[PDB]
Structures are given as structure tokens and as C-alpha cells.
Coordinates of C-alpha atoms and ligand atoms in Angstrom, one line a residue:
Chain O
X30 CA 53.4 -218.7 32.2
X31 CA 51.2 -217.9 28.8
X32 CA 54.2 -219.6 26.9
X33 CA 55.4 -222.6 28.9
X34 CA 56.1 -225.3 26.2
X35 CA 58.5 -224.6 23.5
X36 CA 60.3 -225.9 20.9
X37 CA 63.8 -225.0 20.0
X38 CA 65.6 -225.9 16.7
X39 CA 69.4 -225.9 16.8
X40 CA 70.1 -225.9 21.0
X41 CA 73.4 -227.9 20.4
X42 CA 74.8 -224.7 18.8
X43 CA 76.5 -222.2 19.7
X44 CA 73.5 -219.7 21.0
X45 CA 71.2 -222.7 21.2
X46 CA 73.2 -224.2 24.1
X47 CA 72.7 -220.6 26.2
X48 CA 69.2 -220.5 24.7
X49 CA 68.8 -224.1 26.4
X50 CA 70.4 -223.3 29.5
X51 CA 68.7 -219.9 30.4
X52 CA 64.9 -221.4 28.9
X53 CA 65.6 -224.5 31.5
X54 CA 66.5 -221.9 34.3
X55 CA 63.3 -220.2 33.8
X56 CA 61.1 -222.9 33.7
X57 CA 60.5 -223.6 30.2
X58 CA 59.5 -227.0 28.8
X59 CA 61.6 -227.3 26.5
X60 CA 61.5 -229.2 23.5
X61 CA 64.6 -229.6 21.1
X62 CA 65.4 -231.3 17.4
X63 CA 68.6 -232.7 17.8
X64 CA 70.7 -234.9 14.8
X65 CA 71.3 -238.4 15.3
X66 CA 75.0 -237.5 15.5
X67 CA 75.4 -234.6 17.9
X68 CA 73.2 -235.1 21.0
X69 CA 73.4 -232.2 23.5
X70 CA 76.6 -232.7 26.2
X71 CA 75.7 -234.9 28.7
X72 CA 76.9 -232.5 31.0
X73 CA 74.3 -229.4 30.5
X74 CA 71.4 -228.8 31.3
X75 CA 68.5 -231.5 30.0
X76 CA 65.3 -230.3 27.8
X77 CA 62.1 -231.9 28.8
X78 CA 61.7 -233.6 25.9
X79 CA 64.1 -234.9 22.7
X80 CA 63.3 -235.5 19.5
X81 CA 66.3 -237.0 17.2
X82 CA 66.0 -236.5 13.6
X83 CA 66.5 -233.7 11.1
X84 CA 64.9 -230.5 10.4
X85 CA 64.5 -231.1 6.3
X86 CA 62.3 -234.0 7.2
X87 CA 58.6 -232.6 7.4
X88 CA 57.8 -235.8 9.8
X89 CA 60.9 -234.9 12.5
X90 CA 59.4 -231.4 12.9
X91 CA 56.3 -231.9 13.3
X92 CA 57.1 -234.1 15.7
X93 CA 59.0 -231.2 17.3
X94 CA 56.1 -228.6 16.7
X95 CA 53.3 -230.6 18.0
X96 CA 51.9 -228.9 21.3
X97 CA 53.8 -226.6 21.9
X98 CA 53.1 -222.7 22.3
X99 CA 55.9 -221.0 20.4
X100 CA 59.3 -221.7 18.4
X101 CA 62.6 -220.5 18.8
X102 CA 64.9 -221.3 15.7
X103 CA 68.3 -220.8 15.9
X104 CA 69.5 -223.2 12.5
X105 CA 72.8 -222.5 11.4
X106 CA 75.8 -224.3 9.4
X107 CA 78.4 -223.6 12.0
X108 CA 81.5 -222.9 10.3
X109 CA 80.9 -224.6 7.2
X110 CA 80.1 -221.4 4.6
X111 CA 78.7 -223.6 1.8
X112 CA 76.0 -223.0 -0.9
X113 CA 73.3 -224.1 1.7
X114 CA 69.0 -223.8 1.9
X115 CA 69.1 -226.4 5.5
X116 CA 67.6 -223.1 6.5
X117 CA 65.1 -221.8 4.5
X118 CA 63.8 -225.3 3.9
X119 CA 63.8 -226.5 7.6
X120 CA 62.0 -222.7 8.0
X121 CA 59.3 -224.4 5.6
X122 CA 58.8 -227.6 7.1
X123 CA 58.7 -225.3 10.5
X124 CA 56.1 -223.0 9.0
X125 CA 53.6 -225.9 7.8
X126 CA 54.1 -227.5 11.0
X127 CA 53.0 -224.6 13.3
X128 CA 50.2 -224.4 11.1
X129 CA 48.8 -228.0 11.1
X130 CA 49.3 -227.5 15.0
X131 CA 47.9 -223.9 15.7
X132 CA 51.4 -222.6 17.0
X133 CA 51.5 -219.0 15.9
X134 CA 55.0 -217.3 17.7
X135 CA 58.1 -218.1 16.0
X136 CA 61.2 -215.8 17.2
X137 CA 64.0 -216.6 14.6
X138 CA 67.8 -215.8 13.8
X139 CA 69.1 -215.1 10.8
X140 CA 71.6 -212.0 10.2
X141 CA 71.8 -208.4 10.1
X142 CA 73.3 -208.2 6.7
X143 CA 69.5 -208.4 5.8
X144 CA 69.2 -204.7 6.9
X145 CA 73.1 -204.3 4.9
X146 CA 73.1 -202.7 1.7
X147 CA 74.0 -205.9 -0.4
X148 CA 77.1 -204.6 -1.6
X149 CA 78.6 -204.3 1.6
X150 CA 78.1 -208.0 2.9
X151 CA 81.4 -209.8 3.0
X152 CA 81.9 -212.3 -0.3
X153 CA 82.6 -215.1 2.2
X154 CA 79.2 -214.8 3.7
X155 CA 77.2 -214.5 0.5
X156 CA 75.7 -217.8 0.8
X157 CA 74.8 -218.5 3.7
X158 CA 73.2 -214.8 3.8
X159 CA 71.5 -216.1 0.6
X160 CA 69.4 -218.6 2.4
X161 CA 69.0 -216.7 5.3
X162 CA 67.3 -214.2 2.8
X163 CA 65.4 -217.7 1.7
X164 CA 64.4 -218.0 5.7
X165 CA 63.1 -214.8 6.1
X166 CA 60.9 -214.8 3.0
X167 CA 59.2 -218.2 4.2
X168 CA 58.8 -216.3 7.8
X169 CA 57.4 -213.3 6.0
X170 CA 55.1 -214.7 3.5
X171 CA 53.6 -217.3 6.8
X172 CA 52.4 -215.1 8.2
X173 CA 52.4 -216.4 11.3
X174 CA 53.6 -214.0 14.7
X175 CA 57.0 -214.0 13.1
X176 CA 59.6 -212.3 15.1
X177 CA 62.9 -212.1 12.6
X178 CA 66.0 -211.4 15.1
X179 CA 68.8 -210.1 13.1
X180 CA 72.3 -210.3 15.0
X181 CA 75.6 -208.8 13.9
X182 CA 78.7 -210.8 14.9
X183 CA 77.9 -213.3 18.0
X184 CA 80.8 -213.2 20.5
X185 CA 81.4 -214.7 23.9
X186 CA 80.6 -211.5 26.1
X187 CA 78.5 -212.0 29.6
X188 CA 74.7 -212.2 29.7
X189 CA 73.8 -209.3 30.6
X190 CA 70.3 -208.4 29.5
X191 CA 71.2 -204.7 29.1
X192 CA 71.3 -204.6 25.3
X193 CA 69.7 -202.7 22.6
X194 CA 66.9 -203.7 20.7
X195 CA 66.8 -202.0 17.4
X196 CA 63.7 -202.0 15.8
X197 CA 63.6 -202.5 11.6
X198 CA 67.5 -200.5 11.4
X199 CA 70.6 -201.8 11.6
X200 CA 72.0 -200.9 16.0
X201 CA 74.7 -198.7 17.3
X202 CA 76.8 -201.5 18.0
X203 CA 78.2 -204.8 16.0
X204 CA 78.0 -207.3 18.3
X205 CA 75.4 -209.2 20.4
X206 CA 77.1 -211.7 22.9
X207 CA 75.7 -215.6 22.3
X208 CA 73.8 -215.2 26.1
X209 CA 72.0 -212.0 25.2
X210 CA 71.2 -213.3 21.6
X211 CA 69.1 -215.9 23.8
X212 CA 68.1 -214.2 26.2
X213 CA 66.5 -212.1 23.6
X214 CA 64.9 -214.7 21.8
X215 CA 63.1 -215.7 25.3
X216 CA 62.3 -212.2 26.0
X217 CA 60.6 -212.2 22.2
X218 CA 58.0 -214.9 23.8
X219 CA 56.8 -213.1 26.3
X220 CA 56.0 -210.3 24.5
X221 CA 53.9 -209.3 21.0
X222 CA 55.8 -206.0 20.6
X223 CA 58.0 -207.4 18.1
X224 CA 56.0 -209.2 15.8
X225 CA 56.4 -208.5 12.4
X226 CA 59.4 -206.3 12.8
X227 CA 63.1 -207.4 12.1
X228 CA 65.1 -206.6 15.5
X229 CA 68.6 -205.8 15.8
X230 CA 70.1 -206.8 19.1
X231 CA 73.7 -205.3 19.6
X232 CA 75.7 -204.1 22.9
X233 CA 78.8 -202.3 24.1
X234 CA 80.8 -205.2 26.8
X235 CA 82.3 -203.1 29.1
Chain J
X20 CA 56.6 -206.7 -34.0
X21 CA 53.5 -205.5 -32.6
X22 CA 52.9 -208.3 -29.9
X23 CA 49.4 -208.6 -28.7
X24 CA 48.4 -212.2 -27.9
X25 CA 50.7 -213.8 -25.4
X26 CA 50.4 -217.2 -23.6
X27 CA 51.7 -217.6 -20.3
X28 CA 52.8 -221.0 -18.9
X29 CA 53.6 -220.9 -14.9
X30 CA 50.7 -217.9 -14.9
X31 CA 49.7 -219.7 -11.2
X32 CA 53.1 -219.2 -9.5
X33 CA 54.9 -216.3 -7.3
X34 CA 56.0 -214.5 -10.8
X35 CA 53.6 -215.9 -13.0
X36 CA 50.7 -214.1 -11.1
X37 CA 52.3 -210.3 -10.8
X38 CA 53.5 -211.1 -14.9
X39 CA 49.6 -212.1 -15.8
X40 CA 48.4 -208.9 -13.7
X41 CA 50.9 -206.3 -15.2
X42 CA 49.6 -208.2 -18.9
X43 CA 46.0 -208.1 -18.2
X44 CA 46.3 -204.3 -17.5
X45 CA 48.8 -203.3 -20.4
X46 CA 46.3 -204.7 -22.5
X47 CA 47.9 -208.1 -24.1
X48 CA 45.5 -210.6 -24.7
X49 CA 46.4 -213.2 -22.6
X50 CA 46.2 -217.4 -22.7
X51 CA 47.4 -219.3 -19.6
X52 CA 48.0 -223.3 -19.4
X53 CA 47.1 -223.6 -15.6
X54 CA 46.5 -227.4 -14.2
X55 CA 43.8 -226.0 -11.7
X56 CA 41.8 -223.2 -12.6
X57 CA 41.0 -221.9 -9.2
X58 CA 45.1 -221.4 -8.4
X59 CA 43.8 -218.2 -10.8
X60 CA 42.7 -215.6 -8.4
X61 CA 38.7 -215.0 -8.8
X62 CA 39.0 -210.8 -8.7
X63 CA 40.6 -208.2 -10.8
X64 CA 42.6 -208.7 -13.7
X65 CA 41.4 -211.7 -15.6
X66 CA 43.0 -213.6 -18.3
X67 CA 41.0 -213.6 -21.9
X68 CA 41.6 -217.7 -22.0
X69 CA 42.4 -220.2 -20.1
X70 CA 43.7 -223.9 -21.0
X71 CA 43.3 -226.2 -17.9
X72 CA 46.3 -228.9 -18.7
X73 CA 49.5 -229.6 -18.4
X74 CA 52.5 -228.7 -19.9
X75 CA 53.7 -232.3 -20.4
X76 CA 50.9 -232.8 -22.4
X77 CA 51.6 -231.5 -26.1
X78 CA 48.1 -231.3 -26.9
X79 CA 47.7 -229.2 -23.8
X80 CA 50.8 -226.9 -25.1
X81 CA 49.6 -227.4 -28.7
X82 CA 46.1 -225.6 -27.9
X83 CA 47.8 -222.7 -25.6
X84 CA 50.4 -221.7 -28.2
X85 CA 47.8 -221.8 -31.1
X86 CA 47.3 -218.5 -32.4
X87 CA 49.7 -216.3 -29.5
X88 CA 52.5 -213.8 -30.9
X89 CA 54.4 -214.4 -28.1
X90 CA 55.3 -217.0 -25.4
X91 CA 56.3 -216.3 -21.9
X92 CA 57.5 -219.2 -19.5
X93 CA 57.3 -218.9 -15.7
X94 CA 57.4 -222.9 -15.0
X95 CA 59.4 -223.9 -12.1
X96 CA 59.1 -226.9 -9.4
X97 CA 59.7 -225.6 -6.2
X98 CA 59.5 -228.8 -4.4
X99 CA 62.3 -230.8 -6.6
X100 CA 65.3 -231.8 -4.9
X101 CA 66.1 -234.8 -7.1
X102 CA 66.4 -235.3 -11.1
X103 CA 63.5 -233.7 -12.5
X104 CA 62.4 -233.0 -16.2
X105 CA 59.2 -231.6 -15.9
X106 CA 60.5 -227.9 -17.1
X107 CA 63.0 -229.3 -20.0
X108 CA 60.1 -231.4 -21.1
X109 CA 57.7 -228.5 -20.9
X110 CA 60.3 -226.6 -23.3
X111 CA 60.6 -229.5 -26.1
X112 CA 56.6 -229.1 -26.1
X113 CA 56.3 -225.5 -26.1
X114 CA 59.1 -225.5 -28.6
X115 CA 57.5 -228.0 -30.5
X116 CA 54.1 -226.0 -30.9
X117 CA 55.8 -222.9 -31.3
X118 CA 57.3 -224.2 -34.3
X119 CA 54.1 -225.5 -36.0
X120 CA 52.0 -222.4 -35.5
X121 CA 54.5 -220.0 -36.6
X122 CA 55.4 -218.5 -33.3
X123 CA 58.8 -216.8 -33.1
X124 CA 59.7 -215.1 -29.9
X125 CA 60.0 -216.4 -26.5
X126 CA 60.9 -215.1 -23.1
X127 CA 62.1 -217.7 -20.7
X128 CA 63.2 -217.8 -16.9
X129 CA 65.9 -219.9 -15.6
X130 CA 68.6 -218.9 -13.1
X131 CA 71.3 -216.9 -12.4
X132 CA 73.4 -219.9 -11.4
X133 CA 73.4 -220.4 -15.0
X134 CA 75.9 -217.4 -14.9
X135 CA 77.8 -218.3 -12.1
X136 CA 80.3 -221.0 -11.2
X137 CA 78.7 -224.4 -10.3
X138 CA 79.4 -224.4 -7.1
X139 CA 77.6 -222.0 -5.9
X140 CA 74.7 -224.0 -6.4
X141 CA 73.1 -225.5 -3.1
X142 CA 73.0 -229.2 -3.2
X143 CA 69.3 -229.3 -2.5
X144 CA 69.0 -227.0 -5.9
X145 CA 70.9 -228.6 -8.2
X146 CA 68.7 -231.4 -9.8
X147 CA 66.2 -228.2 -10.5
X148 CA 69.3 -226.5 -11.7
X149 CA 70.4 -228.8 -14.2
X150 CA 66.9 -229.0 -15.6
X151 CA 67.2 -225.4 -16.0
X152 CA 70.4 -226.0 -18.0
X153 CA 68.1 -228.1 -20.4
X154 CA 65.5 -226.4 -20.7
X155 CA 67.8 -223.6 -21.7
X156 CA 69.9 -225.5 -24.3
X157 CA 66.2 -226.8 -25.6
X158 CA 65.5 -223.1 -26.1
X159 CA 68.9 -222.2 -27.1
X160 CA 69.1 -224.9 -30.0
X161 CA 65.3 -224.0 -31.5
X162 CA 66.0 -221.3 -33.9
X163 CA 63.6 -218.8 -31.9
X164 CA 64.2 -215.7 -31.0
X165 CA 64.8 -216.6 -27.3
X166 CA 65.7 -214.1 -23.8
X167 CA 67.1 -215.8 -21.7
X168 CA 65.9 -214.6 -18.3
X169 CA 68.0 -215.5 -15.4
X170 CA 67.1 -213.9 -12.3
X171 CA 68.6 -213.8 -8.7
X172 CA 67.0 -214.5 -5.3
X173 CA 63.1 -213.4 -6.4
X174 CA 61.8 -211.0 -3.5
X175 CA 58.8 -209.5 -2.7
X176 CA 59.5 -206.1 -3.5
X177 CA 56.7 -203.4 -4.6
X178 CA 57.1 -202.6 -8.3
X179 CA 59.3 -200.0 -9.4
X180 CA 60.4 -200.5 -13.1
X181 CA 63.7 -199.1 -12.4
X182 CA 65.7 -202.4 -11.7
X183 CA 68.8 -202.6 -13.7
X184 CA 69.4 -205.1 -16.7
X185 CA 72.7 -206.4 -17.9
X186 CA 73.3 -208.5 -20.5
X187 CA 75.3 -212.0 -20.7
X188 CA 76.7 -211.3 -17.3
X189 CA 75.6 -210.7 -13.7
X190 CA 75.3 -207.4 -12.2
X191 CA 74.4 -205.2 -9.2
X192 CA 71.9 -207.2 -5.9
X193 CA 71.1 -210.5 -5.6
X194 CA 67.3 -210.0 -5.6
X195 CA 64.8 -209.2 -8.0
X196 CA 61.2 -208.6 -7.4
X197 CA 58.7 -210.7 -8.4
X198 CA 56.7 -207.5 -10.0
X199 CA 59.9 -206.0 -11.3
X200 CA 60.9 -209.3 -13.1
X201 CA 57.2 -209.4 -15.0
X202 CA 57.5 -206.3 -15.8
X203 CA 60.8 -207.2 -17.4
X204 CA 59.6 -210.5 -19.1
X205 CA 57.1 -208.1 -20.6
X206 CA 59.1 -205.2 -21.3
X207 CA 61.6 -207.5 -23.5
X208 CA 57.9 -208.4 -25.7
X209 CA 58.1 -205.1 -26.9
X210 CA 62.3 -204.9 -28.1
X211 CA 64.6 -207.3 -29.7
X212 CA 68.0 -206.0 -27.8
X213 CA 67.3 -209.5 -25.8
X214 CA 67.0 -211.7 -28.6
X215 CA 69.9 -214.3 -28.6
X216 CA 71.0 -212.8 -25.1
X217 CA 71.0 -213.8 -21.3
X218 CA 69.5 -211.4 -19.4
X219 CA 70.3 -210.4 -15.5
X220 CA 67.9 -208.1 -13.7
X221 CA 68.5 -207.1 -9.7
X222 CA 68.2 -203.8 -7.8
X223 CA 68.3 -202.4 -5.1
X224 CA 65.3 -201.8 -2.5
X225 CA 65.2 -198.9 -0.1
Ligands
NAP324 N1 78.5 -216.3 14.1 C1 78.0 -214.9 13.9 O1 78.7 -214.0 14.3 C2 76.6 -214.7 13.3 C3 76.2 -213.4 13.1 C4 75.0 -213.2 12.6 C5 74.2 -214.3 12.3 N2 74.6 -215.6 12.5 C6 73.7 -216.7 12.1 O2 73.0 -216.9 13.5 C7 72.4 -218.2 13.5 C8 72.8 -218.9 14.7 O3 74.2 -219.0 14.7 P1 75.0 -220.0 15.8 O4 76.5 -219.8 15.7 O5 74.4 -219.9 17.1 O6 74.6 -221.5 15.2 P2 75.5 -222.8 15.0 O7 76.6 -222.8 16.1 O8 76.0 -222.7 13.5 O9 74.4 -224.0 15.3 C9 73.6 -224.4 14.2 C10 72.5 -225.2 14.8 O10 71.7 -225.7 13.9 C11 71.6 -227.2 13.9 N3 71.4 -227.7 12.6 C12 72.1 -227.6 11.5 N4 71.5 -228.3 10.5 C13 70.5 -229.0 11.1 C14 69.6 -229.8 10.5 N5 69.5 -230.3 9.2 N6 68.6 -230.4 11.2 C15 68.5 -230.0 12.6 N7 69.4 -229.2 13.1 C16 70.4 -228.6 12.3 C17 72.9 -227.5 14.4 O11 72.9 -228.9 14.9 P3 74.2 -229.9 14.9 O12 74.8 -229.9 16.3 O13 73.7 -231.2 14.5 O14 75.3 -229.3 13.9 C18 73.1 -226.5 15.5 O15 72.4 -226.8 16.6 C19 73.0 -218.8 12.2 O16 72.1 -218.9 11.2 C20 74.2 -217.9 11.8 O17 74.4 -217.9 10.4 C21 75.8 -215.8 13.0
NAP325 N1 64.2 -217.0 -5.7 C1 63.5 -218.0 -6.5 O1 62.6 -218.6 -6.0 C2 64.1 -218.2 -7.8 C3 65.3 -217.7 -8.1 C4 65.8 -217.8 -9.4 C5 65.2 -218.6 -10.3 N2 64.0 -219.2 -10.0 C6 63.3 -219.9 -11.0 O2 62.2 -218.9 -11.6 C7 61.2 -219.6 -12.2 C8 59.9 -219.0 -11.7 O3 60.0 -219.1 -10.3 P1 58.6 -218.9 -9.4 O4 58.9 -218.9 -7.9 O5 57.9 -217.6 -9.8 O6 57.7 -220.2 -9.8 P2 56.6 -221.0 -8.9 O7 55.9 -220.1 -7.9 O8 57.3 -222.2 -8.2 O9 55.5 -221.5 -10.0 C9 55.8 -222.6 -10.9 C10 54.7 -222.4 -12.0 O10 55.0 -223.4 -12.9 C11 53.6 -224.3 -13.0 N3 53.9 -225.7 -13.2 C12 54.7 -226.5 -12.6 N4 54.6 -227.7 -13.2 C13 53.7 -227.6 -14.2 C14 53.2 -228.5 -15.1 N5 53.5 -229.9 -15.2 N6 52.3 -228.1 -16.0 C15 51.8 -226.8 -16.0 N7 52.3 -225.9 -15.1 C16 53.2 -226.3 -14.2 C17 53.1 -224.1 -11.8 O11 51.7 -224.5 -11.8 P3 50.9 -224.9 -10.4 O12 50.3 -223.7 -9.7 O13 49.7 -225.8 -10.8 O14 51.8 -225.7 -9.5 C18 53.3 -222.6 -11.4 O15 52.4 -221.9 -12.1 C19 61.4 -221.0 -11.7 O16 61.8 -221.8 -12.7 C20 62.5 -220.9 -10.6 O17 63.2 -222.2 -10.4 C21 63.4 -219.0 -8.8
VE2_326 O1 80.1 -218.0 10.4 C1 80.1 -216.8 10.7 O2 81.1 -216.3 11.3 C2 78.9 -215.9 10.4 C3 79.1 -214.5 10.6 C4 78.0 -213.7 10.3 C5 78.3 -212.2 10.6 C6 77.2 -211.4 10.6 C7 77.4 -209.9 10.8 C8 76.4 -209.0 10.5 C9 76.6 -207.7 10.7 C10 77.7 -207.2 11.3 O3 77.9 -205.9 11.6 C11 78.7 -208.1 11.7 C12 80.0 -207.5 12.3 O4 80.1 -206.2 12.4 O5 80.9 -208.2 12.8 C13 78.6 -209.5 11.4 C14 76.9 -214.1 9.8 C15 76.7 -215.5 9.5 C16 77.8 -216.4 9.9 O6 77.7 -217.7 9.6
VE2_327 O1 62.6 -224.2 -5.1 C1 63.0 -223.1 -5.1 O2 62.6 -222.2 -4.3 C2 64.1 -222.6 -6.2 C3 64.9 -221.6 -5.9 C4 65.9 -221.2 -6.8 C5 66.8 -220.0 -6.5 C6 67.8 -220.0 -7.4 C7 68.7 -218.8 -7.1 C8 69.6 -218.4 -8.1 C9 70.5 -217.3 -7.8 C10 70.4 -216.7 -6.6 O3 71.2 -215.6 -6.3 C11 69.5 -217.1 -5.6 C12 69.4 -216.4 -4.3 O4 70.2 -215.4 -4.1 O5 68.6 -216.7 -3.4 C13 68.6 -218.2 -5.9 C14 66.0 -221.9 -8.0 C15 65.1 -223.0 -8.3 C16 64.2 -223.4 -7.3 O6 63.3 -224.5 -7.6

């Protein structure tokens, strides 16, 4: 494996628990940022390594960032559609932290409403698609191996690794289930065929 | 009217540097107030003076307003999440100096939250926020002639000088370009439609 160690940001979420699961299965080295408060289940599956802290504190993610060989980032607010920049900012601390460490792939999540004509996305998801327009600046203007994964709506649907990748366009369909939405994100590290292009990953559950 | 000597304080940030370009090549005369000269890129379109200081020194203001027909502010403090005065303070002095060398016109960016309801404000951005509200009360309450420039999210756009302006309310995207919002700090040097007015440029990239 040419990426072994890895860090992922936000594996007690919703994709980030598949993302977890499916990295562990495949041998990854996985290592997460978790919050003091939510730990992952005790139940699941078990990263190689846990760092507890925040991602808006430089120190916590560099502790994360240190030695590995890429990032997956997969912050969100959950369903708390607040004024927010928890991602843009923890995107910055990520950024100067793959630098000071030589890690050059990140694979990250923020939306497809960045390839929406703005008047089209939903009121109600405004701000948080404000700050994920915040995120993919920082990831832009890094310019680190930046692979900018832009899901419509996540649902529960099977793995199934049969989905559509749509390169810098919005897909044919509007949703990605959580499991392919990480299995994409590991499929992102094994390639470089991505980098620099926004990728729309959508399928038909049937 | 005829505006040819400008000063330019922020001339070192994301805007500040596509605004002293777009001058430099129109043809102003242009004197910046940079704390560290070689922030100023080395190549191509130079300013005619520079002023190393700081803009919380009013001897440092006092000796880059001397003389200008114009003023254009571009300060910001990316990196301040907690009470900060460092851009209301900079106003008092640039305020201060305009007064005593008889300059009358300034073009000053803010925020769009400014328009909006508080809380859309993330909590991260509101100290810088409410410095912004200063600084534009400070600027407000001088007497000037005073735009009030109050921009959305600020992109990375090419320049297109079609962007759409409105007047003391919001309007169309939520994203300016850095290049399209010099060119409009510049474009309102040459009009006074602005004067006494809040100013909301966006548009749309294709
Ligand atoms: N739901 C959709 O249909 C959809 C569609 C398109 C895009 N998106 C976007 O896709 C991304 C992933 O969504 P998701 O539903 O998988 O995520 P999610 O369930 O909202 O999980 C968010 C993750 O980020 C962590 N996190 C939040 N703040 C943190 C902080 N300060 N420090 C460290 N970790 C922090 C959370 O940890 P905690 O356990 O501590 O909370 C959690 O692990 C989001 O950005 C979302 O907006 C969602
Ligand atoms: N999407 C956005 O980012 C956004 C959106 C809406 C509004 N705004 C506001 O737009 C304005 C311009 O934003 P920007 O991103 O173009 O600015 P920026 O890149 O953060 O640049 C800030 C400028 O102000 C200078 N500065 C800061 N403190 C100074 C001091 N004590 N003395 C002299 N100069 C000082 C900086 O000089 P140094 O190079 O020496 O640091 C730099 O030139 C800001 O006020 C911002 O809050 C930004
Ligand atoms: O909390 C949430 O529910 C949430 C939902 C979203 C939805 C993004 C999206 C984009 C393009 C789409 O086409 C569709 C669709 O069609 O359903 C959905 C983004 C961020 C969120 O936090
Ligand atoms: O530190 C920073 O980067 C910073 C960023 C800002 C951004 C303010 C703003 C206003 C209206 C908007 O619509 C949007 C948007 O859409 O992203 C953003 C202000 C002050 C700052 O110091």
C-alpha cells in the first residue's frame, strides 16, 4: 500500500463511521480526531490510533496530521444548520498541518450546491453551504493534491461501488448513499486522477 | 473630481493586491501603508510610494494620506475571533488625517452582514463583525463623502467588470471576486452615485 496511514476528520459521523469501517477492512491505519464528548461506539470497528481534541485547535490537528500519508475530511455540523466556519477554519488548521508535515493528498466533502447555480440552493442550507464555499477556497488556494468530493443528498442505500463519478458537473443522479460516499473517498487515495477537480458521486439504488 | 492620487491601506491582502494592480495600470498614482514591504510582490505593477507602518500609528496614517485625492481601505484581520479594534482604530486615524489634509472621498469595505439580520453571523465572525460595525459608524459620522462597500463571500473569480451593484440592499450571489470588487472600489473613484450609500456587488460565475 503507497497510502497506508491516514487520518480521518469527522469518523463518528454519519459517512465517517462507514468511511472508518470500510478503511479498517482494508487495511488502513487509521487515524481519527474525535471530541472529548462523542468518542466513536464502543461497538465498531477501532482506528489504530485516537487523538481527542478539536479540529479549530491548530495543536489537536497537527497532532492528527503528523505522519501520515493522506487526509480524508468528512467535518460537518450534523443537523444543526447554523451560521458556522467549524469547517473552513478546521480546513485551515488541516491545510498548515499537511504542510509543516509534507502530507500532500487530501480528499474532502463538502456539497454539490457548489456546482448549483446559487439561486437554486435551498434557503435552509445557505449557511452551511456558505462555509463549505469557505472550505473549498482554503483547499483550492493550498494547493496541496486537493481532491474536492461534492455529494448531493447522502442517504442510507447499500455499498455498492457501482456509482458515477462526475467529473467538474453536477451527476445524473441526486443521491450518493453514506457507504459509497466513503468508499469514494478511499478510492480518491489510491488514485491521482482526481486531483484538482471537484467530483460529483451520485447513483441510481435499485 | 478628477481623482489621481490615491492611498491604499490593506494594499498586501487578497483584495488589496488585485485593487493596487488594476490602479497601477489605470494610471492612479498610488501610496500604500504596508507593515512589511516585501508582502508587495517584486514584479509588474508597482506602486509610486510606499509607507512601511502601521495603521494604528497616526503618524504612519498622517504621512500616507498627505497629499492623496482619494482613500481606499482594504484592512481586515483575518485571524480575529475575539474583540478586536485594530480596523475601527485604523478608521479614527485615517479619518483623522483625512480631515487635516483636506481629503474628502473614501471608499471603505466592510461586510454584507452589515445588511443582513445578525444572526446570520457565524460565532467565530462576529468580534471582526462588530468592529466592522465601528469602523463603519466612524466613517459614517465624519462628514466625508464615504461608499460603503459591503461585499459577500470574496472568491477567486477572473475579472469580468460585469458584476451587478445595488444600492442600500443585498442583491443577486453571495460571492464577489476579488478582481471584480477592486475594480468596483475603483470604479466608485470616478462617480458620486455611491456617496452617502451602502454598496452590494455579487455575480454570477460561469
Ligand atoms: N446530509 C446530506 O445529504 C449532505 C449532502 C451534501 C453534503 N453534505 C455535507 O457532507 C459532509 C459530511 O456530512 P455527514 O452527514 O457525513 O457528517 P455529520 O454526520 O454532520 O458528521 C460531522 C462530523 O464532523 C465532526 N465534527 C464537527 N465539528 C467538529 C470539530 N470542531 N472538531 C472535530 N470534529 C468535528 C463531527 O464530530 P462529533 O461526533 O463530535 O459531532 C462528526 O464526526 C458535511 O459537511 C455535510 O454538510 C451533506
Ligand atoms: N470572503 C471574505 O473573506 C470577506 C467577505 C466579506 C468581507 N470581508 C472583509 O473585506 C475586507 C478585505 O478582506 P481581504 O480578505 O481582502 O483582506 P486580507 O487579505 O485579510 O488583508 C487585510 C489587509 O489589511 C492589512 N492590515 C491588517 N492590520 C493592519 C495594520 N495594523 N496596519 C496596516 N495594515 C494592516 C493587512 O496587512 P498585512 O499583509 O501586513 O497583514 C492586509 O493588507 C476585510 O475587512 C474582510 O473582513 C471579507
Ligand atoms: O443537513 C443536511 O441535510 C444537508 C443537506 C445537504 C444537501 C445537499 C444536496 C446537494 C445537491 C442535491 O441535488 C441534493 C438533493 O438533490 O437532494 C442535496 C447539504 C448539506 C447538509 O448539511
Ligand atoms: O477572517 C475572515 O476570513 C473573514 C471573513 C468574513 C466573511 C464575511 C462574509 C459576509 C457575507 C457573506 O455572504 C459571506 C460568505 O458568503 O461567505 C462572508 C468577514 C470577516 C473576516 O475576518
Amino acid at each position: 500500500m503507497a497510502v497506508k496511514k491516514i487520518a480521518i476528520f469527522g469518523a463518528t459521523g454519519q459517512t465517517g463511521l462507514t468511511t472508518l469501517a470500510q478503511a479498517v477492512q482494508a487495511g488502513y491505519e487509521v487515524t481519527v480526531l474525535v471530541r472529548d464528548s462523542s468518542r466513536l461506539p464502543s461497538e465498531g470497528p477501532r482506528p489504530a490510533h485516537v487523538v481527542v481534541g478539536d479540529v479549530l485547535q491548530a495543536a489537536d490537528v497537527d497532532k492528527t496530521v503528523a505522519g501520515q500519508d493522506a487526509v480524508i475530511v468528512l467535518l460537518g455540523t450534523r443537523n444543526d444548520l447554523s451560521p458556522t466556519t467549524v469547517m473552513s477554519e478546521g480546513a485551515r488548521n488541516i491545510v498548515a498541518a499537511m504542510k509543516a508535515h509534507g502530507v500532500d493528498k487530501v480528499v474532502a466533502c463538502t456539497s454539490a450546491f457548489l456546482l448549483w447555480d446559487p439561486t437554486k440552493v435551498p434557503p435552509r442550507l445557505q449557511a452551511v453551504t456558505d462555509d463549505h464555499i469557505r472550505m473549498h477556497k482554503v483547499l483550492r488556494e493550498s494547493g496541496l493534491k486537493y481532491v474536492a468530493v461534492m455529494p448531493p443528498h447522502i442517504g442510507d442505500q447499500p455499498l455498492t461501488g457501482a456509482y458515477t463519478v462526475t467529473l467538474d458537473g453536477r451527476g445524473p443522479s441526486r443521491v450518493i448513499s453514506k457507504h459509497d460516499l466513503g468508499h469514494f473517498m478511499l478510492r480518491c487515495l489510491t488514485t491521482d486522477e482526481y486531483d484538482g477537480h471537484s467530483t460529483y458521486p451520485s447513483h441510481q439504488y435499485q
